[PDB]
Amino acid sequence: ATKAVCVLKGDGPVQGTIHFEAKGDTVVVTGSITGLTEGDHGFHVHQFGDNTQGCTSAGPHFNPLSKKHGGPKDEERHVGDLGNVTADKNGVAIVDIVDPLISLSGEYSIIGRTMVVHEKPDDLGRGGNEESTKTGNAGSRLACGVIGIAK
């Protein structure tokens, strides 16, 4: 309801624990992802909490409003579009995102969906090519986990 958690795992070395907390009409996303290459990595909620085929079965970006892909600060974005996390030289990205569109309740609830961190930076839907309007050219899914209710 007010707190959620996600453990991201994959076939490679990328892992992390993400926490979610409802604050006013926002959700605060914190935690850290480890094992990344230094630099930016796309970071989105995908539609399905389905880990039967790794991160592949998570489906596309959570997009209940049928909008094009964007950055978290854009009006035109998927609900799940949380932009980029940035990993330091040691491969650690400290996640600190305050987002007004995702929710832990109601129609926009991300409970039971999947958090995904990507191989490449998210171009935030500015590129204008076809792939940018769906995924932001973030490339493959390095690690993922199902978003669960937390104590």
Does position 129 interact with a second copy (CB under 8 A)? The reply is no
Residue 78's binding partner out of Cu ion, a second copy, Zn ion, none, with CB under 5 to 8 Å set by partner kind: Zn ion
Kindly write out the interface string for residues 69-108 of this chain, putting x where it contacts a second copy by CB under 8 A and - elsewhere: ----------------------------------------
Among residues 22, 106, 124, which one has the least CA distance to residue 64? 106
Residue 146's binding partner out of Cu ion, a second copy, Zn ion, none, with CB under 5 to 8 Å set by partner kind: a second copy
Q: Is 16 helix (H, G, I), strand (E, B) or coil?
A: strand
Indicate the annotated binding residues.
44, 46, 61, 69, 78, 81, 118
